[PDB]
Ligand binder design. Structure first.
Ligand code: ADP
Ligand code: MG
Lengths: 374, 270
């Protein structure tokens, strides 16, 4: 039906053949944030459209950060000289116990809660006594490394942080006097310290991640256990978010792809973390783009308080062809008309509904031939 | 004392502007003759003595870790006493608790049934701990120490800084946070009495309960409701007597379940 801001980027075409031109940095009326939700079944053109939009923003000066479970952004990253991070290779190790930047608030306390979320995703049946023994072992393992409550993360070198190894070893030592509080905790933690999952976390953060185009590839976890997927994705999202605070460049775009992977009904704090990120990022004048299939996953009773805001709050939305369950979930959530329902029903590749504030239109996405090399 | 049908619990709620203390004490002597009161107004001192029972005028005294949950009740006692505590300061305090305990040689796996009231650490050692921590962590510990001073070796230290009708009246004109705090503590110690000796059919009166209402720490109230549900689980009776404080938006979730005899009043209870 037509959406043309004076300037910005061209996203695709009208139903009448007119260019849809959108400036996602606008503020005013129904443009309250710069955030996107991109929802569709596999193969509908989600990653492609994202790549086109990111390319066009990057060209204008946006730094771009991407979490990439499908390995869809590697090539584009090469073409732009970006930093490509192999989060499963030793060279891409991201230490979860590396405290992340935030009247006065203790960086350490903040990061201990983050870890509650992190260790709940990875260890799913942790009792309340273990939770707090773990939070205690955490602070203690920090102390022994010379980091304390006032300590400023910005000044600490990557290798001074403790790892899950020290945490696991402290838990074993404690198990002696406390076999019942720590016993089962220590053993579960071994897997991450020395065992099958240690390649991910048992060492210092390997990378700086200073570039205007970063991608965290987590592709090598596609066949790993769910809890490993989820715990690594959350660690990576937390590391990635820290980059915006660490050096608050404006118009940064943070892209979390296949975001459904983060959903854990028993630990909705991970999606809350995502929800909070979309809120905070407005302050830094950036953009959170959430890309996903499996929409209903967000809308589950345990996570829906969080998921629902995550997906419906963003000023810009792109809905392409949907899975049957997902389409009914979306039609209800975003009050799609009947026309808008059917549009997405027979929607062809790269075609669907584009939302900007309260403006919703039929759109067909298409990239210029000179861009295709990306 | 009944059960079944419409008789689910043995709780009471006496509300009014009216003689709730009279009525309460009479029926108390009454249920008694067939055989634990928090009294901030000395309304049972004389009666308690006429019964010749016992009248008396350490919060740090404590699979599931006895320590790990006494740590939570503790975080409430402390939110009540220190009103402007930051999340960081709260966490700092909690950790301090754990460490002060470790130095007293009590851990996560320790049976609290084996520690003399003397072996427990007190608020003094928590203060000394924090003062020490505050040298390297002033941002996180400085104010927490400056604030714990009056409770360790200052104007409140008499209340807690030693190894441990419950008369509260001596704090009737103190700061409301202090009185709210002690009320909370005594309430803890009493509930402990009645979760240590399962002498059934016990009544625990909470006189003027609104004193334990802090819109910013509705936890003390949550604890009230908890005690009210638990006591049934030990075949007993909680009695809350009070003169809207319980129905306020931030406490109501607790105070509605809690508050559900009516004397002179009103609009809210109608
Ligand atoms: N608008 C488009 N024009 C041309 N090719 C497209 C378009 N959208 C997607 N494709 C291609 O079709 C395939 C599916 O798109 P993709 O974004 O990977 O799907 P998904 O929705 O699963 O992320 C990709 O190989 C991509 O190159
Ligand atoms: Mg995709």
């Amino acid at each position: 039906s037509g959406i043309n801001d004076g300037s910005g980027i061209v996203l695709g075409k009208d139903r009448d053949g007119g260019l849809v031109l959108v400036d996602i940095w606008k503020r005013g009326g129904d443009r309250t944030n710069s955030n996107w939700t991109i929802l569709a079944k596999p193969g509908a053109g989600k990653s492609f459209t994202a790549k086109m939009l990111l390319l066009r923003e990057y060209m204008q000066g946006s730094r771009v950060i991407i979490i990439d479970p499908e390995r869809e952004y590697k090539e584009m990253c090469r073409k732009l000289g970006g930093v490509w991070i192999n989060c499963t290779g030793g060279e891409g190790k991201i230490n979860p116990l590396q405290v992340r930047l935030r009247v006065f608030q203790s960086p350490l306390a903040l990061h201990i809660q983050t870890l509650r979320t992190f260790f709940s995703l990875y260890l799913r049946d942790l009792t309340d006594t273990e939770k707090a023994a773990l939070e205690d072992a955490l602070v203690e393992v920090y102390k022994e490394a010379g980091i304390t409550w006032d300590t400023d993360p910005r000044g600490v070198p990557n290798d001074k942080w403790p790892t899950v190894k020290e945490l696991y070893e402290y838990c074993v030592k404690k198990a002696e006097e406390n076999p019942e509080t720590y016993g089962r905790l220590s053993v579960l933690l071994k897997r991450a310290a020395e065992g099958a999952d240690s390649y991910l976390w048992a060492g210092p953060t390997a990378v700086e991640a200073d570039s205007d185009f970063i991608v965290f590839d987590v592709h090598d976890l596609q066949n790993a256990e769910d809890q490993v997927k989820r715990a690594q994705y959350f660690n990576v999202l937390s590391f990635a978010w820290n980059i915006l605070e660490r050096d608050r460049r404006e118009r940064t775009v943070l892209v979390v792809d296949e975001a459904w992977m983060l959903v854990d009904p028993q630990t909705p704090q991970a999606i809350a973390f995502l929800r909070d990120t979309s809120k905070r990022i407005r302050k830094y004048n950036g953009s959170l783009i959430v890309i996903s299939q499996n929409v209903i996953d967000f809308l589950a009773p345990e996570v829906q308080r969080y998921g629902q805001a995550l997906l419906d709050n963003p000023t810009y939305k792109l809905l392409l062809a949907q899975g049957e369950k997902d389409l009914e979930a979306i039609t209800t959530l975003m009050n799609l008309s009947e026309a808008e329902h059917d549009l997405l029903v027979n929607a062809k590749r790269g075609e669907g509904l584009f939302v900007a504030g309260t403006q919703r239109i039929h759109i067909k996405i298409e990239a210029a031939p000179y861009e295709m090399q990306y």
